[PDB]
Amino acid sequence: MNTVPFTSAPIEVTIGIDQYSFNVKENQPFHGIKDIPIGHVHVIHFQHADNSSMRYGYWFDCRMGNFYIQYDPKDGLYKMMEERDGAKFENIVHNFKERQMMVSYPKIDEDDTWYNLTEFVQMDKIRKIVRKDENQFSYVDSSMTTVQENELSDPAHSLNYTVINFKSREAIRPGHEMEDFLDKSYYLNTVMLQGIFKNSSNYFGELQFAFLNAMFFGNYGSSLQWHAMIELICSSATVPKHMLDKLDEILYYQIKTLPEQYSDILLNERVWNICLYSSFQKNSLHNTEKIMENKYPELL
């Protein structure tokens, strides 16, 4: 179990770690988060008490380095940094633990939620969507736009999700205009899975990462990407059986975790009704359909 220490907490802020969150008051002695489960990516995220504008945060994996948080009063935000001196770090942490000012990552033993939300998410793939190669961790916030959004403006600060566009030369073969538009199996299996993602695990990892950025930061382009990747599978008549079963589990846990009061802005009525009731896969998402119907029957 690993630790992300904080130099201090000079401004009042709500801190998230994965699906958990807690309030820290201005200049309240706070020294970080301990007992973080090894084996998963994590996100530590922030919403200042004085400006709910800009949720922002950092994706990281404690196996890749020793990371800490330090408020920067010039740029006005909590920044993740890497400590390269290993003995300095162990020494800082051990002292803060001995003084008991660290929230304990509060995982219930039975609870597989975070695993289920991040099953296919890898740091190395995050770092290709979020390009900033001098750090081992990745910054995301509410306002960052996607490559595709910028095509329809600062490239260094973009989310480089894979571009999916159903009315595009990539999506539609010369001569199969109707066939490929009404059944996207070509685009899913040949163009995207075999060509771009290489396997379904990388496809699911980007889908899950897009969802989590939508949920935690309100990132609109991430929500668009999540729905596009769902719709591309549901609109394919020919999908490997193992992918459909895994997709149902993925979405089930995403819908289960979504804040009930954010469903109005984070769920696209058209995609979900098409996917669950009209598409080729309308009968292949049993778990997802059951939870959607019992939790958000208004949307449908």
Binding site: R169, E177, F181
Partner: protein, 237 residues
């Protein structure tokens, strides 16, 4: 974007544009089977592709063989329409290709857009006008060439005959849409109006009678009367 009453003069400017109407592409008769079930039998159809500035009509005849062994024909018909419009544009010299294509029914937008994806600079637009181009099969010579076709065929017409020698495109289109609106609301009466006087004839190379200017005013008046009437006969006013 969408074409409506407020941007109506754009039809007669100097940017090449085409209307595409798919109403008459898939046409059927519905009948009883020997077992007392219902079946359809397809008849020849046509795509109505019209330059409203010049009157040039590209009438692509859709022969019933194109439906043989196909399913979901009303959906296929929109994609076949877009394939054929696509093929027509690809056959025209660059300087004759349209800068916009206006579809009369919104269900044609996605099929045409997908087919034209490599013509990124050709705008595909809907319209809010309720245009009467479905009545094109009430023009006898167009109906005749569609029903007689034994194979796929493109036939070129000028739907304005020689009117542009005397009137503007705006006025010619207004006359065309009035004639077709009348033919759509009450075909028998409209056709009676157009041929009542046996001394006014249709030239071999024309679609409509050779009316003088004064006779067109009378004709156009009679068509307006018919349309308002039928609207009484229909709604009782």
């Amino acid at each position: 974007g969408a074409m409506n009453s407020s941007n109506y003069a754009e039809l007669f400017n100097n940017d090449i544009k085409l209307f595409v109407d798919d109403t008459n592409v898939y046409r059927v008769t519905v009948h009883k089977t020997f077992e007392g079930n219902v079946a359809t039998k397809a008849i020849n159809g046509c795509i109505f592709t019209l330059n409203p500035k010049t009157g040039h009509l590209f009438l692509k005849i859709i022969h019933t063989s194109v439906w043989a062994g196909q399913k979901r024909l009303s959906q296929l018909a929109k994609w076949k329409t877009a394939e054929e419009v696509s093929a027509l544009v690809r056959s025209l010299p660059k300087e004759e290709q349209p800068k916009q294509i206006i579809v009369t029914r919104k269900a044609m937008l996605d099929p045409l857009e997908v087919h034209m994806l490599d013509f990124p600079n050709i705008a595909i637009r809907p319209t809010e006008l309720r245009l009467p181009f479905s009545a094109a099969m009430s023009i006898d010579k167009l109906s005749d060439v569609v029903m007689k076709a034994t194979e796929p065929q493109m036939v070129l017409f000028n739907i304005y005959d020689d009117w542009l020698d005397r009137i503007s495109s705006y006025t010619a289109f207004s006359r065309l849409t009035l004639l077709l609106r009348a033919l759509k609301t009450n075909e028998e009466s409209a056709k009676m109006i157009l041929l009542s006087d046996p001394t006014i004839t249709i030239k071999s190379y024309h679609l409509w009678p050779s009316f003088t200017d004064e006779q067109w005013i009378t004709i156009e008046s009679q068509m307006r009367d018919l349309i308002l009437t039928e609207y009484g006969r229909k709604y009782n006013v």
